[PDB]
Symmetry: D3
Subunit: 268 residues, 6 copies
């Protein structure tokens, strides 16, 4: 049963789903806790984004979240704080197989992200650290030969520059998906982070269509359910539909307001 | 400003609200994290219960959640894992002023809980450690003289025996409130933690009435608005209306379901 | 897949193996780390003992080691620091289903350990916290109804007194297994923790025979292959065959020595 | 009362004091603990420096120190380990509003530090992560519109090069203060980290005067009380007058020596 | 060098100094941090008290502070949160050799504290875990045979009752020292923790004299040089002369005040 | 005795041994725990490598491992995640004296690593942070004057490029040792991380010889005992002969298999 566990441990199920065109519904994890990560792994999402960029996580807290999520069907995706080969290698070492790389502005940057995930001759990943959690400390059979094909690289586009360069980014082998950051894009476009303007929505919708038609997976984070459904209709394949901190804050506020109202009606 | 900060830090605002008969709406905290504690401290609850009994908290995690909540209006209440004077001493040292003590079965046990929170001659609290976070390392003026009156002891009744002893429990000086846990009571009564039976509900309602009419604050953990209003109309004063882990799981699941994940 | 995950999470596979009479080979975990726990969970042991008694673990570190081990076939067993119902409640809340309870001296103490793991009417476990990791925050269907039967209580006998009381201990319903710690027994018997004396070995062997013949599982911690086979031939069912700290120190020292460091 | 809390949470009180010319007396925090941070927040300092450069802190320990200090009147300032926009954004995300940026050598570097703290069009800060502790998870009203003006950027000058470039650094909009590192400056000047030589003191004093006369706030760390008072007389506005580790070590040593002397007098 | 390291690690240098009648100057550690513990280990104190009773420490933080202090000449003493054999066992396992046991009221309790630190037949310490940090994972040669004699048990007297029982406490074999906490005693005596009353001071001085004249070491926590010299002249042998949290707060405040912050 | 402790604390014993030509046998630490570090410090190795590159460590966990190891005879060496002066300075601050710097490709990079460890005029280390654990919070007498000479810089060569540049790397003053990464070298040479090919072994053996004959210390990590002995015979001076995670995994698997076999023989 150890044998079968390790055989099964290599396959990147999120990647397989993207390649099959199966839309994957996700939740962003900013609570930076292995405890809430496990709780949320039971909620039914296809994927969970462990945010190493804008939540107080580091390689060690990423590791404990991966350990928490492991037995659940929900698949982990990890965002490093930047497109940094050193950060990427440390994340791969602890077992990350799907990366959401921020601030990818052009094809050279996209290529650098891909190369950081692949062993020679395909990239610059060091074979010497294969013995970490990535290969389960040398228990996954034929790990070195199998690893490159199971890496899934998703690049974020969040500026006018990146949109301009989207066709060349799409041409990069090993870019499996392209994620759009709508608030950052809006801000770069002069709309102050409010994506609900025609010019911003036009840019977003056109990019989703272009990514999908290039044979790659479009992604986006959108807390507005109606917009999320629109992006799915346009062929988006990895759509994060909320953020754990927001879900918690908004549910808690709604609860305090409703019951607070009851206390006030009894004791004016 | 420091002097004014410290002069203000001593007052137990939760206790003052209970004594004024102002109902207090609370949320249970089982996420055992200073980060979600701060986030939830901004949501608008009157009180937050840092659960040391059934969440993976210890004195250290209670400390950081107290630090996180401190600047917010929401008031922290801590549940130790048992009515243990040592555990109570440690929670007080880190700055806990309102305790929710589990499994208080009789007046002797209620008295023991109270005595654990009070300096001599009123109790057995060791003055040794006035110098911990409780006195802000000896910055709160007249701390020793002021501390006993700002302690707020709430006792849990969870069994048929505790219910039988309620009148005697209510007579214990220093018991400020009595909390009923409907699930545990239902379980002890034979209804497998399902509180939605007339016999359980009858026992709960009568207890709330007795507690309030004795001049003490009734508390309860509930999830239904209409039942909450009913317990409020019957005099309940510290009503916890959800649990952080549950709120998060249910919101998350509802969201995933809306997309057919 | 979530529904199927949760339906499967309830079953105590270790308990099922003991009841089927399948010997289970274990490793003691004293490294008190979720990282080495995961590494060791892949090594091929049937069970891993997360030691809360003689390693620097607490409920929080037990939790993270349970999360680390979860996806592997190796089954976790947790040793609390004492036969304490509060500590037992907390370990159960974080998801412990198999307990190794130290210093059980008599049937009363064995019964107390069992009762601590069971909901009413079978025990004193508080239903209050079905909602912790134990029920996966209320996702495991019919958790309350199913939990008691999946709890596995193993009691340690460490003294001459415990040995004298063994027949009565074996009669306690809900005692699934009895573990003998050869070092502590040897110490109590006057042999300074050296178990390699006929009198100690005679006492150990007879206990294993009595336990198995009563229909319960014998357990022991040993390091020698031939002695392990002997205890297995005598009916032992949960045999721990090393300790992580020892394995690591001895491997490290042997390596350094081979280079004349 | 939540409402009023969040309204009050936005204002950078340290910045306001600097702009008003009110000298601010500070303590350096290198103990890297939220517990001693809270203790020291009660001591009466105007500001506390959470040192992310030369103490064993990271974004997560910075967060817990900010949470500890929050209810006290003492204001937190955070030093990142370098002038790195990625580190700066993570610090801003967890709620940092005043940054002390090390090793700023020229105006381009000073400009880069400022831009890392401001949303478009003023800088390169991403609006997408406003939902972290910075906006108290979207509770601070009009956070995006208010954030830029409450950021306070202090740049360190600690080399001959930086002194040479001081006039241009002073010309950078959004540089609110310039901190002098006297030991590093001394070392760069050939005086081996001992600042008590005329040439080093001349450089330091002249820079304080120049910074203040440019309309900006001078800062410095100085454990020598007499020098601290001199720098204040010259118009310095954020003066750190000790370091927690040093205060603890020196107080402890003095205590052991005095009582040790007593034990020795009784038992020669 | 390893063999020589381990041969040297067993010796309790603090105990040896007390037995030689060499006064030992100490600092209380409440900062609950391995980093400040190391810093303070270099300051020149003979001993450092890692407070498990009134600081937010647990067995894990005690462990890291022991590791931090280890290479320095200053010797660690640990205060458990209570006279609890389980807590004592856990502290010993991580390598504690000198215990300061709070709230020892009578000889029975003193004997219980001693017995908790000793292997059979001298006590009830479980040999099971010689293999933890205490034996350096079985590297200290002849650990089991040597451990009992290197344990140093110091008991706290905090009440009028404990004072009455002092003669009997002093007669307990294995009580190496008796510590008086002036604040708690003052509190029990009716003086609200203010030890600067003749009646309290009279009781303290007489106790120090009785302890030393019985052949045991007196200890106390004080802050005044002249009072320290007086207690030293009266025979005190382990004198704590400040508290880390207090030293830091007072130094910090004095500094801020000098600049009119 | 404090005095004598601090006098003794400055000397880098690992460096002294390398300079004396005494071979030093090491173990790699990837378990990222101060508890197992202390355990392993008692095992008899000359040195222990605290891996900040490919294990889930950070400056703070490095600090706790240094504190754990301190009283033992085994000497700590720390690998930062990259040749980064900011990371290097933080490691030096917490008391690191021997650094194993990854991915050093040429002499300029080797020089940069050395300079990051030395105070002016020899390098760019800041004197201002000498007051951290490095000087034991200002207790080590004459720390500033003594520090440079006790720093020990070991550079990793792990590519064909680095091998090409080895003669120039050897010429860099302050490079005390050169470590060869055999699996990474093999991968860069087209042999897929398996070092057991003649061309890879020829490269490795020749480099060891060249490093030693230049008057510098050769190093390598090799879990194969027979190869380790060959490299020692060729004059290697710091040879890591295993990895803690591997030793633990392999010992545990052997144990489970042997006793599992016994259970199976009793209960077929």
């Amino acid at each position: 049963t150890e044998n079968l566990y390790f055989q099964g441990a290599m396959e990147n199920s999120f990647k397989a789903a993207l390649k099959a065109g199966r839309p994957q519904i996700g939740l962003w994890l900013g609570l930076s806790s292995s405890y809430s990560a496990e709780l949320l792994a039971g909620a039914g999402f296809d994927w969970l984004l462990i945010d190493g960029e804008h939540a107080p996580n580091n390689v060690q807290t990423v590791l404990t979240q991966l350990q928490a999520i492991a037995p659940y069907p929900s698949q982990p995706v990890v965002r490093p704080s930047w497109n940094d080969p050193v950060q990427i290698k440390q994340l791969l070492d602890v077992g990350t197989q799907t990366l959401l790389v921020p601030m990818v502005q052009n094809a050279d940057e996209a290529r650098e992200a891909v190369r950081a995930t692949r062993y020679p001759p395909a990239g610059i990943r060091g074979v010497g650290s294969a013995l970490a959690r990535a290969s389960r400390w040398n228990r996954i059979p034929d790990y070195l030969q199998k690893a490159n094909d199971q890496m899934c690289v998703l690049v974020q586009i969040e500026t006018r520059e990146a949109m301009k360069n989207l066709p060349q980014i799409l041409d990069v082998e090993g870019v499996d998906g392209v994620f759009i950051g709508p608030a950052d894009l809006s801000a770069d476009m002069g709309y102050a982070g409010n994506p609900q303007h025609p010019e911003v929505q036009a840019a977003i919708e056109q990019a989703i269509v272009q990514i999908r038609e290039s044979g790659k997976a479009p992604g986006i984070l959108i807390a507005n359910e109606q917009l999320a459904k629109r992006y799915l209709e346009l062929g988006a394949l990895f759509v994060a539909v909320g953020v754990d901190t927001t879900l918690l804050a908004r549910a808690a506020e709604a609860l305090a307001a409703r019951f607070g109202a009851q206390a006030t009606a009894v004791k004016p």
